[PDB]
Ligand binder design. Structure first.
Ligand code: CL
Ligand code: MG
Lengths: 231, 240, 244, 111, 243, 250, 241, 195, 235
């Protein structure tokens, strides 16, 4: 009310309203799902269009050969943060000849988002990210929120009506975690998970966006006729 | 450094500071530009509440940017000096690097660009000035007349007016100026410019300034007696 | 952050006016009146000191009239402290021009630059404008004797006779009445004092409440002399014109 | 005084056919009259069917190859996984080399 | 009024309301504790299991500074991470110049001064964390608790977060019943119990226990996490005490 | 972080007033009375030593300060603002004058430099005006003895005699009656003590009154001998005993 | 009313932020006292440790700035430590630049000038503390100099600070009226500490244990704080008289 | 670059400047004009380091032309020479100085007098009845000491100048490919096409 | 007042949302993409009849293979175009090739959010960027001041946008010829324009692989206007 003019101001109950309003931009964004087994990690993203004449907004971004994310909210802020991740992944490779740990990737994003919530003039990032990766300690899935809070998970979903997919994964936890050495079945579980967040619309060929990374699988994105198999 | 965003959008999609700069232009003394077949004429109002003035040394309303281009304005006088100075420097800088004087379009585009930069730079307010830039391109006999405004938009005009009561003189020019047949001579072009100012001015004594620009850097400012002859001629024909 | 406390000194009103410039002019209208009168053979600068105290040291004082170089002087109306900042800048600018071209600065060039500085404070930087109006009296070989004025807006204009500060409306009417183009310096001296004597808010105009200066070609052959009047010299000129 | 350059020796050779191309190089690395390694490769697969070698001062050569490999990577990110053509790679390498015009990479580069 | 809208503004009381508002964010956060012992310190924290989908043991909240200092915090988790990142820089520059690892009181002031600096200007926000930290140095064991104002003191036991009063009451009993001292292995077990007892103030979601420790004898003066058999032993001890 | 206050905190109000300068002058009005009188062969400056507590040593707090060997200063208003101004005034006398010309500045020019500093606090970003009025007495070879007042605006005026602060209106009236152009220095000190007794309420002695003069050169106070041209400081602070001697024949 | 939020003048010539910083001084509810002997300067302060979980050895408002200078603060600990760290740095730098130990009164002036800047410059707030500096200066002898948020400072024969400051002040005033001298006419510092504690007991009307007080003593060439047992020994001496 | 001369007579200033531009063992050009018009009644000839000469000349030209537009007034030859001297005086203590020598020939319309200024790359200004830069002076100065008179006409000045060029063509080692001659007077600047 | 980079309670940047209102006040611009080319057309909208309409430059060349049409505060577009042109030429210098249309659009959109307390406010102008490259063929992009860009088969921006977009929805198909697309822009412009459409107050352009980006002459557009009127009367 009087305490939401900028990010530098606390409310009387100890809340940062500008950070909460940035969190609200994620809820308006299109649904995206993340899940993993022990061998692979999968991102499934429902892309959104302006109208029938427009293209469908690309949700998934590649950060390295072994890491990438899906976005929900302000797409330009996802571009800034993914570009920062690309640089940090790349710094780790050039200097240390070392693939950046997915856990460190999260720690770096957390600290970058935080600085914007404590200084006058700037603003919080208006986007949530689901980072998947395969590193030296196996498959990983992370959930980034622009408050700074990063969380490692077996599965999750963010965006509009994400609670439907998140409940499904909470039931399916024991099944999909043991889909080892089988990419297609892990994707099928992710496609079935995102389907629980659909209302009126269904998954079409140029609407669905899938990405996968794993043991002997680089981070690759599937769009168009390549995802027709999973409808 | 002072960083404040002074020029910003409002809920209805307007930049009020730019629009309020247009009000400062509307307050300013009237300026008119009329281009003929082989010339351009820049007419300017001078308010007559100021007597005991020294017209020798008082800053003239029409300023030379180079030997072939001129700039008149309406709005804040102090702001206009800053634009004129920058334009004069750019004119010489263009001669130095391109080995050719500026076109009237290029000089206008530069001045308009400066005006635009002050509508989205931190710490600054927009220029409270609209300009009429007139002249002839190098080795060219086609007359050029351009207008700029605080927002930074610019465009070419067959004839145009700016400043206080400019909507009255624009109404006059819209019916009196023929596109198919512009003022064929210098005398015809000056007369139409003086006529248009006489709709607004008050008296035709030391209130009207006229500056005629012709091809190949041929610019001259008319004196009181020379302008007074047009005023005397128009009033006698009017009584009919 | 600090946005909360920003007055926003360099913005337009809805009417298209600069708030701070208008209010700075309102400040200047309460300052002691300063008059400039330009004659054919010289210039007069006259100025009324702001409500003098009897224990003020008058002979070793400088409030209104300041020397910029040998050929140019200024009369001040407004904040003295602000004026001194601008004066020392103008003094430097004159010497930079002399150093560069080996010629004394033309009056208009000095005036324009000083006026351009004032303009800057109204368009950018977020600072308050200078609460000062100048009357510039000077001579050069191009235009001869010249009177200018500048104000907090940074706008300057040339004049034959002009007043700044208090009661300019009344003062300008009286100058407009009695001024003529073939006037001499000694006549202009008399006009300057008579105008102050009528427009003054004091009971009677005296030597101790005035600063006075002339710029004549009254030196020996084709050269300009600046005369900042002493107290006794103001006392004598006031008796000579029949005011006291 | 400190000399920032050195000569690591070796030699490289590129030949172009009708539907193929070879880039060869010996595996010996040296300083003065000593052998440093009998097998230290200096011809590298950089991706997009581009092979590269920068022979001369090995530190500068490794740095350049490393930077070009990285240039290929960022070309994919910034231009929708587009294949870097050999002619485009060549022009990109000119800018890498000329960027150090006044403190150059002491290498003869072949792609 | 309006004295609470801007940081670094004194109210007519002499108070900085923005700092007091940051304390509310700390009070909202999960419970974290610190226990000083014979030859070291023990840290513990409550991790709320929001969902089955959270990977157990893989959202680590306790952080190490240098090799000998442990830091835990309650409130805004990112603000705590920012403070630890500074702590690591301060500890690094100390060791760089002075060779020896940073002493705990020295380290405590480096954070204190940095946090206090964020109450001096309206262009910055105060920290939304209370930080419990400490370790072992040349002079022995030290436990500290730092607050949003920049205020810190040494402690025998420290607690902050939603269940701070429950934890404080339980800590006060340990200080009274063990005047000669508490051992390191005991303090780990007690830490577990106090987190389980303090969980009664946050009992909608069930939780995950995380403990760490520095001890001159048990960990050789270095900061380590409590894992495996020693962790499960402490959990079982805590489970037995609630029933 | 960083100083985001890059804008003026003193601005013109619709009436043409500079609010913060007026309010700074109000703070000077609240301040303790100080005065200055100019004689033919000297200048005197004086003020009351308002003690914050009787336990406080009023000797350690110096309201009358040496700026150069021939220039002194006294104030009314906020003491901390005065203290920093004296530090800056002393330094500017060296940097902008003595390091250039090899001699101390004349009174009028040092006053001008102090006035500049006070004007800048009226216009610069993120600062308030100084809450003091200064009285600066001094001597220099070509101007002789002189006395100046400097206000929060940065304006300065030369005075034959004046007073500032609490009871300045009454004190200025008293000085108008007693001041003439033939006053010797001792006569001016006598009048200064008479004028100051009116405004002081409590004790009136050498321990509660601070008084200094700008008079003849003091070779004894120089610290060395051998250079004939160097004859010593004209500024002298009167001792507690020296004041009490003149209070008996009052 | 934004003239109460930042350090600019109000219509009546006042700086409200400075005045509110003075009220922050008493937020800790602690009273301090300082007196001078022949050879020494003693400073005493109340020590209140409410929480049982606190380590009482780390609870202190007295600071060792340099070897010769000590400082007691009345105000919140973060601002106290801010001022202490700065004073320590200033005292060290002075010694390095000018080749001798910074005097107590010069450090007081320097910290006062810093405090003055916060009252004039807008972006910096005042520190809500009153700093009392004590030493045995090699030129001026036993010295007490005190600084506040306004940037004011002055030397003292003796002084007191805190909520019940006025009661302590008048108690000391009445003693110096009687003794007819500027100091405590006493040879050893031990008895000057006993004087300080005794007159604080009389003024405040409370008794003190060893853990209720905190004592700092300045002698020639060193300033040092007393331990709990050093104070206990001192309390026993008062009780047996 | 090499030969630049100047002669001030009664009513005009005459500037002669060599046409050759040599680099190495090749005369690249034999028709080069080593001068710029600064204003309608002020001409500046130049000689020195390659590149620097033209870069400096055009830079000065731009500044004087800018002044002329701003004030609607021509600067006096004395004023232009002082401006040029100061630019060279700054230059000499720069990281890389302009190695350019100049002659400034102008007609002062206020005094009705021709004026010739000689300024070297250090910023050393002198007003002279006749001037030269480089090795040229070693022949021409002594020649002009003898033959020059202050009251000469422009035609007498051109014959006096022909005498200098003949001497330089006889005794100079390098072929400088003749000179371009320009006259500065009350009517402005004009070029003598047949020399 | 309030911060420039502030979020609303709904999760949108105030200044970005307000700039979108400015774009709605602007003159209409329409783009249609086909397999034979991309057509760009604009409403000139002269404020007075004395204004020489040919000087109104609202369609602009970025490179030979990329064109651009604008709508809103058109003065703000000058620096965006300047950046696009530099980006396009710079890429050709570094890589000896034409730059992808998408990569150019991305480079322009990176400027969009570089504002705050960098420039003082968002841009008040939307751009239609049309082009061709070897990889993805004929493309049309809509670049907003939010920093977002969408590819479109067809798109209208400006004051008549919502009415024109609904018309484009029905009329567009994947087999449209270039000639068909030219007439369709003229048709839809004539429907949403206030004043009557002619060669002087409207301007057409296209980009083809063969001939590159070309702004049409007033003589060429006039014949397409005459061809359009005859075809509508024919049924
Ligand atoms: Cl200081
Ligand atoms: Mg020479």
């Amino acid at each position: 009310n009087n305490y939401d003019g900028d990010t530098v101001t606390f409310s009387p109950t100890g809340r940062l309203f500008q950070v909460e309003y940035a969190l609200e931009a994620i809820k308006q964004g299109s649904v995206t799902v993340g899940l993993r087994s022990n061998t692979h990690a999968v991102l499934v993203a429902l892309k959104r269009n302006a109208d029938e004449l427009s293209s469908y907004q690309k949700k998934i971004i590649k950060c390295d050969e072994h890491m990438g994310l899906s976005l929900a909210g302000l797409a330009p802020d996802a571009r800034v943060l993914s570009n920062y991740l690309r640089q940090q992944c790349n710094y780790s490779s050039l200097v240390f000849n070392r693939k950046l740990a997915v856990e460190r990737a999260g720690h770096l994003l957390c600290d970058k988002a935080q600085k914007n919530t404590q200084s006058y003039g700037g603003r919080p990032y208006g986007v949530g990210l689901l980072i998947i990766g395969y590193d030296k300690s196996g498959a990983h899935l992370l959930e980034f929120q622009p408050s700074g809070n990063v969380t490692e998970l077996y599965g999750t979903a963010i965006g509009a009506r994400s609670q439907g997919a998140k409940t499904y994964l909470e039931r399916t936890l024991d099944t999909f975690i043991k889909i080892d050495g089988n990419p297609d079945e892990l994707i099928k579980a992710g496609v079935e998970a995102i389907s629980q967040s659909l209302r009126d619309e269904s998954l079409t060929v140029d609407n669905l966006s899938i990405a996968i990374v794993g043991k002997d699988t680089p981070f690759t994105i599937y769009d168009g006729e390549a995802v027709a198999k999973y409808i | 450094g002072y960083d404040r965003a002074l020029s910003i959008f409002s809920p209805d999609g307007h930049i009020f500071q730019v629009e309020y700069a247009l009000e400062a232009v509307k307050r300013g003394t009237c300026a008119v530009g009329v281009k003929g077949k082989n010339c351009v004429v820049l007419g300017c109002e001078r308010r007559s509440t100021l007597k005991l003035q020294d017209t020798r040394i008082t800053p003239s309303k029409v300023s030379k940017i180079d030997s072939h281009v001129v700039l008149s304005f309406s709005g804040l006088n102090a702001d206009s000096r800053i634009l004129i100075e920058k334009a004069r420097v750019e004119a010489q800088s263009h001669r130095l690097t391109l080995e050719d004087p500026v076109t009237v379009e290029y000089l206008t585009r530069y001045v308009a660009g400066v005006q635009q930069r002050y509508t989205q730079s931190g710490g600054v307010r927009p220029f409270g000035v609209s300009t009429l830039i007139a002249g002839f391109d190098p080795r060219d006999d086609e007359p050029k007349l351009y207008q700029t405004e605080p927002s930074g938009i610019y465009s070419s005009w067959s004839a145009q007016t700016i400043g206080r009561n400019s909507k009255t003189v624009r109404e006059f020019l819209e019916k009196n100026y023929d596109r198919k047949e512009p003022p064929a001579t210098v005398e015809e072009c000056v007369k139409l410019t003086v006529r248009s100012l006489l709709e607004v001015v008050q008296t035709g004594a030391k209130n009207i300034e006229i500056t005629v620009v012709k091809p190949d850097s041929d610019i001259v400012a008319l004196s009181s007696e020379e302008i007074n002859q047009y005023v005397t001629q128009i009033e006698q024909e009017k009584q009919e | 952050g600090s946005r909360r406390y920003d007055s926003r000194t360099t913005i337009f009103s809805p009417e298209g006016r600069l708030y701070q410039v208008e209010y700075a002019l309102e400040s200047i209208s309460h300052a002691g009146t300063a008059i400039g009168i330009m004659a054919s053979d010289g210039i007069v600068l006259a100025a009324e000191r702001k409500v003098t105290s009897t224990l003020l040291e008058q002979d070793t004082s400088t409030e209104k009239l300041y020397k910029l170089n040998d050929k140019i002087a200024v009369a001040v109306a407004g904040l003295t402290a602000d004026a001194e900042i601008l004066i020392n800048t103008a003094r430097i600018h004159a010497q930079n021009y002399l150093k560069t071209y080996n010629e004394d600065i033309p009056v208009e060039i000095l005036v324009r630059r000083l006026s351009d500085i004032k303009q800057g404070y109204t368009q950018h930087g977020g600072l308050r404008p200078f609460g000062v109006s100048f009357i510039y009296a000077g001579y050069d070989d191009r235009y001869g004797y010249q009177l200018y004025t500048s104000n907090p807006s940074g706008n300057y204009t040339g004049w034959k006779a002009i007043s700044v500060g208090a009661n300019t409306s009344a003062a300008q009417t009286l100058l407009q009445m009695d001024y003529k183009d073939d006037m001499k310096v000694d006549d202009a001296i008399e006009l300057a004092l008579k105008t102050l004597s009528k427009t003054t808010d004091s009971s009677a105009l005296t030597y101790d409440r005035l600063e006075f200066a002339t710029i004549r070609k009254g030196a020996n052959d084709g050269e300009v002399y600046q005369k900042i009047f002493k107290p006794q010299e103001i006392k004598d000129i006031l008796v000579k014109t029949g005011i006291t | 005084q400190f000399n920032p350059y050195g000569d690591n020796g070796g030699t490289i050779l590129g030949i172009a056919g009708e539907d193929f191309a070879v880039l060869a190089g010996d595996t010996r690395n040296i300083t003065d009259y000593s052998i440093n390694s009998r097998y230290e490769p200096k011809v590298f697969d950089c991706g997009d069917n581009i092979v590269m070698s920068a022979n001369g001062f090995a530190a500068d050569g490794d740095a350049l190859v490393k930077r070009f490999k990285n240039s290929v990577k960022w070309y994919h990110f910034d231009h929708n996984d587009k294949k870097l053509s050999i002619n485009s790679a060549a022009r990109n390498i000119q800018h890498l080399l000329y960027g150090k015009r006044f403190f150059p990479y002491y290498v003869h580069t072949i792609i | 009024t309006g004295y609470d809208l801007s940081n670094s503004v004194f109210s007519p009381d002499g108070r900085n309301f923005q700092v007091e508002y940051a304390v509310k964010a700390v009070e909202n956060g999960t419970t974290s504790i610190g226990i000083k012992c014979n030859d070291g310190v023990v840290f513990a924290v409550e991790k709320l299991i929001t969902s089955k989908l959270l990977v157990p043991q893989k959202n680590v909240k306790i952080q190490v500074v240098d090799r000998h200092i442990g830091c835990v915090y309650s409130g805004l988790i990112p603000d705590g991470r920012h403070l630890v990142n500074r702590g690591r820089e301060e500890a690094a520059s100390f060791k760089k110049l002075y060779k020896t690892p940073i002493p705990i009181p020295a380290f405590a002031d480096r954070l204190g001064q940095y946090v206090q600096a964020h109450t001096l200007y309206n262009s910055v926000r105060p920290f939304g964390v209370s930080t419990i930290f400490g370790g072992v140095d040349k002079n022995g064991a030290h436990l500290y608790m730092l607050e949003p104002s920049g205020s810190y003191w040494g402690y025998k036991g420290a607690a902050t977060g939603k269940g701070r009063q429950s934890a404080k009451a339980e800590l006060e009993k340990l200080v009274d019943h063990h005047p000669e001292g508490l051992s390191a292995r005991e303090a780990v077990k007690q830490a577990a119990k106090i987190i389980y007892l303090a969980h009664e103030d946050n009992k909608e979601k069930d939780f995950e226990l995380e403990i760490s420790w520095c001890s001159l004898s048990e960990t050789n003066g270095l900061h380590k996490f409590v894992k495996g058999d020693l962790l499960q032993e402490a959990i079982d001890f805590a489970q037995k005490e609630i029933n | 972080m960083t100083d985001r206050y890059s804008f003026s905190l003193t601005t013109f109000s619709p009436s043409g007033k500079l609010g913060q300068i007026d309010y700074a002058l109000t703070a000077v009005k609240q301040g303790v009375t100080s005065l200055g009188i100019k004689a033919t062969n000297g200048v005197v400056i004086a003020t009351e030593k308002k003690s914050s507590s009787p336990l406080a040593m009023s000797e350690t707090l110096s309201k009358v300060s040496l700026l150069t060997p021939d220039i002194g200063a006294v104030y009314s208003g906020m003491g901390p603002d005065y203290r920093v101004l004296v530090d800056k005034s002393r330094k500017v006398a060296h940097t902008s004058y003595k390091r250039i010309y090899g001699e101390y500045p004349p009174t009028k020019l040092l006053v001008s430099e102090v006035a500049k500093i006070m004007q800048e606090a009226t216009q610069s970003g993120g600062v308030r005006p100084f809450g003091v009025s200064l009285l600066i007495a001094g001597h220099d070879e070509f101007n002789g003895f002189s006395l100046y007042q400097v206000d929060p605006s940065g304006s300065y005026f030369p005075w034959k005699a004046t007073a500032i602060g609490k009871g300045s209106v009454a004190a200025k009236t008293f000085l108008e009656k007693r001041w003439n152009d033939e006053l010797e220095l001792e006569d001016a000190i006598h009048i200064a003590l008479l004028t100051l007794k009116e405004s002081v309420e409590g004790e009136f002695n050498g321990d509660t009154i601070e008084l200094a003069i700008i008079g003849d050169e003091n070779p004894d106070l120089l610290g060395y001998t051998g250079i004939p041209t160097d004859k010593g400081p004209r500024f002298r602070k009167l001792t507690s005993q020296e004041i009490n001697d003149r209070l008996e024949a009052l | 009313g934004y003239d109460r939020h930042i350090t600019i003048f109000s219509p009546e010539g006042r700086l409200y932020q400075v005045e509110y910083a003075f009220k922050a001084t008493n937020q800790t509810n602690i009273n301090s006292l300082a007196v001078r002997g022949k050879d020494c300067t003693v400073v005493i302060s109340q020590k209140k440790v409410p929480d049982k979980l606190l380590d009482p050895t780390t609870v202190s408002y007295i600071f060792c700035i340099s070897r010769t200078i000590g400082m007691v603060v009345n105000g919140p600990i973060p601002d106290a430590r801010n001022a202490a760290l700065r004073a320590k740095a200033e005292a060290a730098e002075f010694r390095y630049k000018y080749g001798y130990d910074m005097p107590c009164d010069v450090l007081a002036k320097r910290m006062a000038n810093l405090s003055q800047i916060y009252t004039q410059r807008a972006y910096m707030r005042p520190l809500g503390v009153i700093l009392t500096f004590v030493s045995v200066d090699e030129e001026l002898g036993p010295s007490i100099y005190k600084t506040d948020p306004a940037g004011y400072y002055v030397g003292y024969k003796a002084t007191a600070t805190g909520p019940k400051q006025q009661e302590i002040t008048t108690n000391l005033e009445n003693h110096f009226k009687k003794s007819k001298i500027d100091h405590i006419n006493e040879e050893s510092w031990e008895k000057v500490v006993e004087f300080a504690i005794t007159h604080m007991i009389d003024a405040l009307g409370t008794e003190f244990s060893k853990n209720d007080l905190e004592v700092g003593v300045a002698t020639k060439d060193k300033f040092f704080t007393l331990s709990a047992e050093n104070i206990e020994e001192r309390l026993v001496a008062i009780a047996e008289q | 670059m090499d030969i630049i001369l100047g002669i001030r007579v009664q009513d005009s200033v005459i500037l002669a400047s060599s046409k050759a531009v040599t680099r190495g063992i090749s005369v690249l050009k034999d028709s080069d004009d080593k001068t710029r018009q600064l204003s309608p009644h002020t001409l500046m000839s130049f000689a020195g380091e390659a590149g620097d000469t033209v870069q400096f000349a055009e830079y000065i030209q731009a500044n004087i032309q800018l002044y002329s537009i701003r004030e609607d007034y021509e600067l006096s030859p004395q004023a232009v020479s002082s401006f040029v001297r100061q630019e060279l005086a700054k230059s000499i203590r720069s990281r890389r100085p302009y190695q350019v020598n100049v002659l400034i020939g102008g007609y002062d319309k206020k005094k009705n007098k021709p004026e010739l200024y000689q300024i070297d790359y250090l910023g050393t200004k002198v007003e002279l009845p006749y001037g030269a830069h480089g090795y040229s002076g070693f022949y021409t100065f002594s020649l002009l000491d003898h033959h020059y008179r202050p009251d000469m006409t422009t035609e007498e000045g051109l014959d006096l100048l022909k005498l200098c060029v003949q001497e330089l063509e006889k005794r100079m080692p390098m072929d400088f490919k003749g000179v371009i001659v320009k006259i500065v007077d009350k009517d402005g600047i004009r070029q003598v096409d047949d020399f | 007042d309030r911060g420039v980079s502030t979020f609303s309670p709904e999760g949108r940047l105030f200044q970005v949302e307000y700039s979108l209102e400015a774009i709605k006040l602007g003159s209409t611009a329409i783009g249609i993409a086909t397999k034979e080319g991309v057509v760009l057309g604009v409403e000139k909208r002269a404020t007075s009849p004395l204004l020489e309409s040919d000087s109104i430059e609202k369609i602009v060349e970025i490179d030979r293979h990329i064109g651009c049409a604008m709508s809103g505060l058109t003065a703000d577009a000058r620096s965006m175009i300047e950046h696009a042109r530099t980006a396009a030429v710079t890429h050709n210098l570094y890589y000896d090739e034409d730059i992808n249309v998408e990569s150019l659009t991305q480079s322009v959109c990176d400027l969009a959010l570089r504002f705050g307390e960098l420039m003082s406010r968002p841009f008040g102008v939307a751009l239609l960027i049309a082009g061709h490259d070897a990889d993805d063929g004929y493309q049309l992009f809509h670049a907003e001041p939010s920093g977002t860009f969408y590819r479109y088969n067809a798109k209208a921006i400006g004051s008549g946008s919502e009415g024109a977009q609904a018309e484009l929805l029905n009329e567009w198909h994947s087999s449209l010829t270039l000639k068909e697309a030219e007439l369709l822009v003229l048709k839809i412009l004539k429907q949403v324009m206030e004043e009557k459409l002619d060669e002087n107050n409207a301007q057409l352009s296209c980009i083809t692989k063969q001939d590159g980006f070309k702004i049409y002459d007033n003589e060429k557009t006039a014949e397409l206007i005459k061809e359009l009127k005859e075809k509508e009367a024919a049924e």
